[PDB]
Amino acid sequence: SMHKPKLCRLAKGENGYGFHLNAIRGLPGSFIKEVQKGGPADLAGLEDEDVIIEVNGVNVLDEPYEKVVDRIQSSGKNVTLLVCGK
């Protein structure tokens, strides 16, 4: 929910960022699933079903899933996310 957004900065580990990005075909948006215990997403404060709003300050709400994946995969050693829960 945009009424309570969350900022999270992830430091990439040996297994990447330690989460799955999921999307539902036909519905807008991407969301966090399968946060790995003790991994970067966990330590950064991400929770299951968080929806990604911005990647490194870029609004991704209207971008296709494959583009959001590519932004995160291309970020380098860290990435900053604006997300919101529910």
């Binding site: 990005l21 075909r25 994946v69």
Partner: peptide, 8 residues
């Protein structure tokens, strides 16, 4: 309900 998933 087709779900896309990517490990990151």
């Amino acid at each position: 309900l087709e779900t896309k998933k990517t490990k990151l």
